[PDB]
Amino acid sequence: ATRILLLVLAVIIYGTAGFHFIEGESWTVSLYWTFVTIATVGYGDYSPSTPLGMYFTVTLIVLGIGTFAVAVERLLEFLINREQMKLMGLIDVAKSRHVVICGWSESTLECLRELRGSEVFVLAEDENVRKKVLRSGANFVHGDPTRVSDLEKANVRGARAVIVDLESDSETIHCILGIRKIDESVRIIAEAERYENIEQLRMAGADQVISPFVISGRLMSRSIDDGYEAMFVQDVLAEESTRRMVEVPIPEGSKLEGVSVLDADIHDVTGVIIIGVGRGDELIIDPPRDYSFRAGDIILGIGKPEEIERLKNYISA
Template sequence: MDLPGVERVTGRVAVVLTLAVAALSVLVGILGIVDPGASFGPFADVVPASASETAEFTGAITGFLMVGSALGLRRGLRAAWYSTMILLPVTAAQGVVQATPYSVPLVVLSVLAFPVLAVARGRFDRRISLSTSKLAAGIALVGVQAYGTVGTWALRDGFPAVETPLDAFYYTLVTASTVGYGDVTPATQEARLFSLSVLVLGTASFAIALGALLGPALEARFASALGRMTQSQLESLDGHVVVAGYGDLTEPILEELRAAGRELVVLTDDDEAASRLRERDVNVLVADPSDEASLERVNVDRARAVVAATNDDGQDALDILTVRETHPDVRVVAAATERENEAKLRRAGADTVISPAVIGARFIARSAFGDRKAEREAEDVGLDAALDEDA
């Protein structure tokens, strides 16, 4: 198998392992809380009970963080790779400290996942892109929690129940989220005024955060209703086939690819064709296939191949040139409408050029003389050989 194929498979294994570790971390944490009396492993006698209980509670939290990292890995984010490499030793250590029979698979899987992530590092090279609203939401949440925690601790004389910085953080969180259990209350005028400021700023920061999170979700619902691909769907494309342009010659190619179960996305600036394709649940991005930005949006660098097969050899050549200039390692397969254009498409950068008219003529001529083998080959011919890296 070629190196890009190895990296792609290793990357998928890394995502699966990360999700498995996340699920085990949450499950083991919950089981440890339900069955706190369990004790197992070489460190069971030396680990303090308080440390084991803490690891059980924090294990579930770490598991949820791992889920976020796994989703980031699926999008190829380098930041998610770093966070996973940090969290895997944490989950392994928590499993050891929990000292329960349930934690053994967690420790083993965490240890196994670490080298797989290390080998697949090159697969996760996408930079994280945060919108202004998401950055504002994150800064607001962190800022309010820091403001409330520091302020509550500084004014702890006005909060009789606040004895540690953790108590101050707890009070800030329940106040900012409007939960307000009532177990910590301000006892002085100054503390009450400060609590009001935490309440106002906290509710505002949570509102900003909800807007930043729910906005993309609503966008996804609207995009689904309108038959459009969302940004997250585009970013998750991997090992797919990019079909550059759409024409009469493209239709049987789409049928062949879908019958083979290959993930694909059509890149066309024809709104009418895009609408018809969406009705058949074909992934479409309405954009110019010869535009570099359009190719970036459909993750052409992660594509298995690019297929340029419309009825316009000139446009196909332009699309091929754009792909080859920006992504020289991506395999490009082209179909030549005119036989004399085969050499031109190869010079444009196509790895494989197929002339349907010439191939069809040869099969017809052989079949006319009773060549049954030619008839069977004509029925079975497809794109698999053209898309194969070793073809």
């Protein structure tokens, strides 16, 4: 570890004391000479012509070779051990604005195509998951995502948001109960599977719960006959062919703070159906006529992307 540096200094004390006491030169020239011959520069103006110096320089050169051989084998031991540790996980995460994804499935693959690559750390235990993440462009941290000691190696104490989707519901509930032990304030997003588990996933402490299997189960059995809601939910939320469900913020100033929805009259002006307003971690779906807009509220609406731009200038100052 640290012994190579003391070996370097010991050979320096050997060379200086050998030059000064045999060639009879001063201290500074002996320091300069051992620092020029230890790097094999060889200017050649302070060379020892003395035969005792002619034999002493041989030992100085051979111990210089031995020192540069033990330092190189130490560097290669450290580099090979680090690039073999880092390849199969087994590393500690040191970032602080990153996104930790526990588990790996198709639903967490579709959220990497809307994020950047080296910002996202997938924490899982399988070996095929490792090759899929290293293919897809994120980082891999080998761990058991339920165990609290394997959550702190992904550093969820300073993570931006944590997205949890594991292979069952029991492991998802346990990962959320583990995450709320470390950092109480981080934002956790989970995926439920059964219908009866959404109440447990909220009581365990998840901030946002998505449940796609009950969505498709309710959309299948109500599309046997006509299937008109399925076209809406597919065309708007999944593919975004003709529409897109947007949420736009109301910035400071912004020319309509304090008026009602009747006075602004957004649907005839722009063409965007306002669904609701999000005043601070709640949603008023279909706000009434007597709602007055504030600062920092967010209008949720559906429209073609050229109507979203016509709304984003009607709000802006």
